[PDB]
Amino acid sequence: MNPPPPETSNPNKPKRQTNQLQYLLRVVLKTLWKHQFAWPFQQPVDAVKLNLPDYYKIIKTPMDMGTIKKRLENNYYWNAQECIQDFNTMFTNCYIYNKPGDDIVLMAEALEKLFLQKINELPTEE
Ligand SMILES: Cc1nnn(C2CCN(CCN(C)C)CC2)c1-c1cccc(Oc2cc(Br)ccc2Br)n1
Ligand SMILES: [Cl-]
Ligand SMILES: [Cl-]
Numbered sequence: 001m002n003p004p005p006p007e008t009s010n011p012n013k014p015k016r017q018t019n020q021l022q023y024l025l026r027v028v029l030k031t032l033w034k035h036q037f038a039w040p041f042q043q044p045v046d047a048v049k050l051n052l053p054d055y056y057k058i059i060k061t062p063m064d065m066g067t068i069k070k071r072l073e074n075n076y077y078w079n080a081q082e083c084i085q086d087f088n089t090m091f092t093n094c095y096i097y098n099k100p101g102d103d104i105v106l107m108a109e110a111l112e113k114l115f116l117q118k119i120n121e122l123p124t125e126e
Contacts, residue, residue: 001047002044006044015077020122025072028087029065044064061093062093067086094108
């Protein structure tokens, strides 16, 4: 069975809108989401429908761009580092579960390269 998705709403959690988080939504997330390789990463892994009974035995910190998108749109984060960590968790999970040269890994690698290019221009906090 699938676990509940990562949290995207939590009223008592401290949270902010910073200019860096706005950049992560308007530039970084937007760039990755439109890419031809984004689709596997646009929602949590459905281990039931993909017939992956081992996925959530192996991946204990799941993350995906649908969750990140909801977090950014709901202003769930305190800082940019927390969101950057979510992206890095997503990529790392893909590399942990899959094998070098798999199609999904080639896709994650292309998205990660673009991610790195965009976060190099993360603005100074205003
Ligand atoms: C994210 C993410 N991380 N890992 N995976 C799967 C894990 C299982 N793998 C099976 C084949 N291995 C054993 C060689 C495929 C990749 C996904 C994911 C998420 C949503 C859909 C999706 O569908 C596929 C995408 C591609 Br490209 C290729 C096949 C499918 Br099915 N994959
Ligand atoms: Cl399953
Ligand atoms: Cl493959």
